[PDB]
Design a protein around this ligand. Structure first.
Ligand SMILES: CCCCCCCCCCCCCCCCCC(=O)OC[C@H](COP(=O)(O)OCCN)OC(=O)CCCCCCCCCCCCCCCCC
Ligand SMILES: CCCCCCCCCCCCCCCCCC(=O)OC[C@H](COP(=O)(O)OCCN)OC(=O)CCCCCCCCCCCCCCCCC
Ligand code: HEC
Ligand code: HEM
Ligand code: HEM
Ligand code: FES
Lengths: 49, 73, 239, 100, 98, 55, 378, 65, 54
């Protein structure tokens, strides 16, 4: 029953860098985190100014 | 109304959630957003607008009748 | 009658959503107001320090203030002498009292030109058409004490048409038609109504560049942190 | 009779067969309806909270179900009405006992 | 003690003494031409004195009185039939009529 | 391009505060330059600076 | 264990802003709570600066306001923030009320009644503030509404010579309205806290009307950034309104000084009070007019006592949905008719719009509700 | 002095609406000359002529000025 | 009325012409003095009986 539980496939939703199962996550984390933190940083700069 | 924990009672329900750094910001924002907004528009204008076209007719007709009352003189 | 007439839409130079006033036109309009319109009306809340950096320099401001001597307090004797007035004066009121204003006209209190742009329905186009469209009645004679001008509620003004083709002939070439003097006095009345049209449009431009910057990006952060609930999925297991 | 045609068109256009809800998933809850919800078998109650959680999910995304999973009027398994009738009858009996 | 403190505060919000210093005047009617109204300030409200036409008197004597929600003849409203002296404010909600 | 940016200015918090301050100052400078540039580019002519240059 | 869950202030902040269970469904219409809060503190701050530069007397009030808008640095933008923030405050207030009436959130009783008391308080506060600039429209608005208070027999005339500060609109009237406009938003803030307290007692709503006890998500950090987004949208609308067309909503007829002799032809409120003035002058009776106005907002009090349906929202009831949109168009019609002169087609359709307003609320909602209760076999 | 405004006003009334308004004012002149000693004294015709004429003036003036 | 020409005249108008405005003015001033009397009694209690362990 708990072995019958298979997580569904979110391939419509993932970022294009992490589409395949082969490519790892530790080798491409910093670009994704830096993009989202860049958005938050530009928001913070606009609010502070 | 209180804090978490003692609200409801749920049996077996499984929720999956992906990481936000894992997935894209806007998933297909111009291939599903346009059919969704056209669908939600088509399912509401027939209940919202037929009072407002009556308001538009009242505005135009009242303007025309005030000009009727004043443009003979 | 009570058939009001809406004044037309005139293509001004301050009509657009970012355009500014013409400061040379404000200066010409102020020369008009000094030599024509200041004999009857009053513009109480326009001091000479408003004219220092906007249109003139500072030197001709002192010149224009020392042309007209106004008033001062006691000279330790209680006699209220005449001061030339350096820069801090408001403009000289022609009539002291409202009763004094009625006591030289056919009743008819002259309205105060600080706010006539912002105070009447229709902007400075109303003042343009009121200064312009002096014409004749078809059949209605009223009392021959007042004059006819159709852009007016009541349709009979008590103001003589104060322009009539080169009464000023001011500094540069620019010959005084009806059009030049009316355009300059409408521009000047818009300036005296809103003293900070230019800085308002400046902050409006900076703000449109703000809401070009922030509005994709705060919405991007909202979409990012709400991108967990927009993709969570459910399943129902019974025993 | 055509009033059943009105009822079928109304159940189509009412908007609560769109989100996968049945008839008694949308009931407003005063004290009586809270009692009638507490008086339920376990399987119907779990199916009820599951349909309610799917409805809140689908209205959060403002996406409405495909054609093959709308609840249909022919199989309207309305179930909460007998317990709710029993609650109303016992409540009115208690009210009448207080009145006399 | 409580009702006397409340009475003193309500009487503090009632009026002043110098506002109660308003009394009579005399008004001249010689300046007004035919058929026109002149206003005078009195107790913070305008004060109408209007010269009228005898034809306006005749028309106003021709119009009926029982349709009016306050029945009053024109000669009940004025001593000399054309020089009418009014407190120039509408008695509904405080406006000056045109 | 992005990896160096995350490795420098977004791991620690104090460096993030330092770069939002420095970015706000640089944005202040360049933004006021662009704002006065555009505003005295769409109102060329009828503005007090050129009329001052007449004098 | 933690700083937040033991400290006496941070338990309040925790049950308000961090771990408040909010439903995972509320649309953009549930942003106007925070938008009214941000507008209220923005009104308090910008009005406090205006009150630092203001001299409340009938000789020098208009002169002092002109001194603000010319001589004090940035007094013109702070004054325009205050006025158009009042306008956007009532936009978000009527959208807040429209949400709470449409989605069946008037099944809450005590939150709804404290809401209506807040509506009374904000309307009285904004009227006293509109009296404060001491223009021609402010003078005659004060005069006519004080005589509207004098309309009631046996109570009225003494009460109105009592709040006149004399026998007309004298110095004392301007100073009284300065003081009450300058105190009442703090009472509005306290009753807003009481409003929010009864809400956090009961629990919020959702667009379905189904109780959402299964799917509460915490307030922080989902709805906090959602309300930041709503606040940025509100500030850009407010600031474009004050920097491009500041006169698009305000009255032209304010800017003349207060002459008590003229009585201009086109007397009108500022645009948010048009329908209150449209119910008044479309009934040819004094007590009937003022009583019909008070009965309009008391009809908003009445509204929880006519929830005879068995769903909660109006999402699932299309007949009552169409009748609610008729009600919205009728209120906008009342606003337009109030913002006009008074002649024969305007007289007729003003009377008809007021009649149809009362007929929609007091009759058509339960008739639509009983056709709903009949039609789904209940 | 060569006025531009009177030039624009004399050259803009060629349009058909202004022509029809001109004949409206002239027929009202014929009317009150005909039904002489009356209390209906040519309002709408003159206001409509000024309406149309000053709107065509508004369309095409400030280029010249 | 806060205006430096007529502020003192406005306070004199309160004290002389308005009904009981003199009782309200003196009540405000002497209530401020009694307010600070009660405040220093309060701080003296709070220091002397050792309530400053809170
Ligand atoms: C000028 C008024 C402009 C109103 C604009 C409204 C736009 C949205 C209209 C719309 O889509 O309505 C239908 C929708 C149905 O609800 P929902 O479940 O959210 O939608 C899912 C499927 N449509 O419903 C909605 O989206 C919102 C329904 C209306 C909620 C707001 C009400 C408007 C303000 C009413 C003001 C008057 C209230 C009474 C005041 C009395 C004062 C005395
Ligand atoms: C002051 C007048 C004198 C009051 C006095 O003598 O009080 C005696 C009382 C004795 O206290 P004790 O003996 O401890 O208690 C007996 C109870 N069985 O002692 C008391 O009751 C003391 C309590 C009051 C102490 C403060 C009174 C003066 C208030 C001002 C103090 C200012 C403190 C510093 C503030 C600025 C720094
Ligand atoms: C003395 C003869 C005047 C001179 C010179 C100018 N104006 Fe005048 N103006 C005068 C009077 C007596 C009145 C009042 C008439 C009335 O019935 O109000 C006016 C009126 C105005 C108005 C307001 C009219 C309205 O729309 O209600 C304006 C805008 C105005 N005047 C402007 C104006 C200007 C710009 C002048 C200089 C060119 C000027 N007036 C000269 C008397 C006199
Ligand atoms: C003084 C102005 C008001 C303020 C500042 C205010 C503030 C708020 C806030 C902050 C909330 C919680 C957030 C939300 O649910 O949107 C709220 C909820 C609510 N208010 Fe008000 N409110 C005001 C006036 C009113 C009025 C006039 C009513 C109508 C009587 C009203 C009825 C409600 C209702 C029904 C809710 C609950 C809505 C829900 O849970 O979905 N409020 N208000
Ligand atoms: C306690 C907080 C407040 C203070 C200190 C305050 C202060 C002032 C001041 C000094 C004025 C006069 C300046 C002017 O008229 O432009 C004013 C006017 C006004 N206020 Fe307030 N106010 C407050 C709250 C509010 C609120 C809550 C509203 C309603 C949303 C409001 C609406 C108005 C309006 C409409 C005017 C008239 C603006 C105008 O016509 O120029 N005020 N206020
Ligand atoms: S009609 Fe209402 S005040 Fe005159």
């Amino acid at each position: 029953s708990h072995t019958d539980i298979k997580v569904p496939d979110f391939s419509d939703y993932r970022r294009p860098e992490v589409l395949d199962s082969t490519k790892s996550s530790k080798e491409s984390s910093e670009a994704r985190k830096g993009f989202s933190y860049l958005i938050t940083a530009t928001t913070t700069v606009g609010v502070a100014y | 109304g209180r804090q978490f924990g003692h609200l409801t009672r749920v049996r077996h329900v499984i929720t999956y959630s992906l990481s936000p750094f894992e997935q894209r910001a806007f998933p297909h924002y111009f291939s599903k957003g346009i059919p969704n907004v056209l669908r939600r528009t088509r399912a509401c204008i027939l209940r919202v607008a037929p009072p407002f076209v009556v308001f538009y007719l009242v505005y135009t007709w009242g303007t025309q009748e005030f000009e009727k009352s004043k443009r003979k003189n | 009658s009570d058939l009001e007439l809406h004044p037309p839409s005139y293509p001004w130079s301050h009509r657009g959503l970012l355009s500014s006033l013409d400061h040379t036109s404000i200066r010409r309009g102020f020369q008009v107001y000094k030599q024509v319109c200041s004999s009857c009306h009053s513009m109480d809340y326009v001091a000479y320090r408003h004219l220092v950096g906007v249109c003139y320099t500072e030197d001709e401001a002192k010149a224009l203030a020392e042309e007209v001597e106004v008033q001062d307090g006691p000279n330790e004797d209680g006699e209220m002498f005449m001061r030339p007035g350096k820069l801090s004066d408001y403009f000289p009121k022609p009539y002291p009292n409202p009763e004094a204003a009625r006591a030289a006209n056919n009743g008819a209190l002259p309205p105060d030109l600080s706010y006539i742009v912002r105070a009447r329905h229709g902007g400075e186009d109303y003042v343009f058409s009121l200064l312009t469209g002096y014409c004749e009645p078809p059949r209605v004679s009223l009392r021959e004490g007042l004059y006819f001008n159709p852009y007016f509620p009541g349709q009979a003004i008590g103001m003589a048409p104060p322009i009539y083709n080169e009464v000023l002939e001011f500094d540069d070439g620019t010959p005084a038609t009806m059009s030049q003097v009316a355009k300059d006095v409408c521009t000047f009345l818009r300036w005296a109504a809103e003293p900070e049209h230019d800085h308002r449009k400046r902050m409006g431009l900076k703000m449109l560049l703000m809401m070009g910057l922030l509005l994709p990006l705060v919405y991007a952060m909202k979409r990012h942190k709400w991108s967990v609930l927009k993709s969570r999925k459910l399943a129902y297991r019974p025993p | 009779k055509w009033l059943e045609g009105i009822r079928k068109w109304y159940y189509n256009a009412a908007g609560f067969n769109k989100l996968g809800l049945m008839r008694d998933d949308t009931i407003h809850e005063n004290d009586d309806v809270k009692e009638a919800i507490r008086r339920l078998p376990e399987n119907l109650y779990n199916d009820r909270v599951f349909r309610i959680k799917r409805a809140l999910d689908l209205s959060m995304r403002q996406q409405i179900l495909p054609k093959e999973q709308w609840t249909k009027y022919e199989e309207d398994k309305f179930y909460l009405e007998p317990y709710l009738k029993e609650v109303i009858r016992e409540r009115k009996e208690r009210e009448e006992w207080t009145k006399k | 003690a409580a009702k006397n403190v409340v009475s003193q505060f309500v009487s503090s919000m009632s009026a002043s003494a110098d506002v109660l210093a308003m009394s009579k005047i005399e008004i001249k009617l010689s300046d007004i031409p035919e058929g026109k109204n002149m206003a005078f300030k009195w107790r913070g409200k305008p004060l109408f004195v209007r010269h009228r036409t005898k034809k306006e008197i005749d028309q106003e004597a021709a119009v009926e009185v029982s349709q009016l929600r306050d029945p009053q003849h024109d000669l009940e409203r004025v001593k000399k039939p054309e020089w009418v002296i009014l407190i120039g404010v509408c008695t509904h909600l405080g406006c000056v009529p045109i | 391009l992005t990896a160096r940016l995350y490795s420098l200015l977004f791991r620690r918090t104090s460096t993030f505060a330092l770069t939002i301050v420095v970015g706000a100052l640089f944005f202040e400078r360049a933004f006021d330059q662009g704002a006065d540039a555009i505003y005295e580019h769409i109102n060329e002519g009828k503005l007090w600076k050129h009329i001052k240059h007449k004098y | 264990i933690n700083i937040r869950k033991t400290h006496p202030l941070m338990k309040i902040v925790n049950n308000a802003f961090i771990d408040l269970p909010a439903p995972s469904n509320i649309s953009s219409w549930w942003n106007f709570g925070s938008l009214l809060g941000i507008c209220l503190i923005l009104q308090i701050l910008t009005g406090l600066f205006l009150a630092m530069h203001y001299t409340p007397d009938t000789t020098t009030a208009f002169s002092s306001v002109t001194h603000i808008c010319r001589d004090v640095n940035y007094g013109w933008i702070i004054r325009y923030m205050h006025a158009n923030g009042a306008s956007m405050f009532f936009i978000c207030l009527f959208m807040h009320v429209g949400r709470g009436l449409y989605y069946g959130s008037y099944t809450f009783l005590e939150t709804w009644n404290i809401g209506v008391i807040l509506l009374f308080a904000t309307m009285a506060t904004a009227f006293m503030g509109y009296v404060l600039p001491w223009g021609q429209m402010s003078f005659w608005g004060a005069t006519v509404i004080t005589n509207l208070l004098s309309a009631i027999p046996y109570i009225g005339t003494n009460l109105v010579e009592w709040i006149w500060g004399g026998f007309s609109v004298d110095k004392a009237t301007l100073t009284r309205f300065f003081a009450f406009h300058f105190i009442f938003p703090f009472i509005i803030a306290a009753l807003a806290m009481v409003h929010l307290l009864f809400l956090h007692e009961t629990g919020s709503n959702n667009p379905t009307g189904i109780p959402s006890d299964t799917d509460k998500i915490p307030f922080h950090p989902y709805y906090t950034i959602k309300d930041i987004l709503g606040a940025i949208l509100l500030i850009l609308i407010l600031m474009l309104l004050v920097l491009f067309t500041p006169d698009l909503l305000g009255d032209p007829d304010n800017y003349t000084p207060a002459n008590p002799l003229n009585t201009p032809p086109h007397i009108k409120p500022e645009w948010y009070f048009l329908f209150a003035y449209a119910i008044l002058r479309s009934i040819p009776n004094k007590l009937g007019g003022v009583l019909a106005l008070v009965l309009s907002i008391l009809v908003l009090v009445i509204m929880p006592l006519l929830h005879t349906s068995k769903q909660r929202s109006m999402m699932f009831r299309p007949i009552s949905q169409c009748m609610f949109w008729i009600l919205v168009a009728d209120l906008l019609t009342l606003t337009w008719i109030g913002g006009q002169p008074v002649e024969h087609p305007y007289i007729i359709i003003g009377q008809l719009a007021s009649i149809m307003y009362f007929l929609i609320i007091l009759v058509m909602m339960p008739v639509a509700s009983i056709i709903e209760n009949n039609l789904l076999k209940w | 002095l060569v006025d531009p405004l009177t030039t624009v006003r004399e050259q803009c009334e060629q349009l058909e609406k202004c022509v029809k308004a001109r004949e409206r004012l002239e027929l009202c002149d014929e009317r009150v000359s005909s039904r002489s000693q009356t209390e209906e004294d040519c309002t709408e015709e003159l206001f409509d002529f000024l309406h149309a004429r000053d709107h065509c003036v508004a369309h095409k003036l400030f280029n010249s000025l």
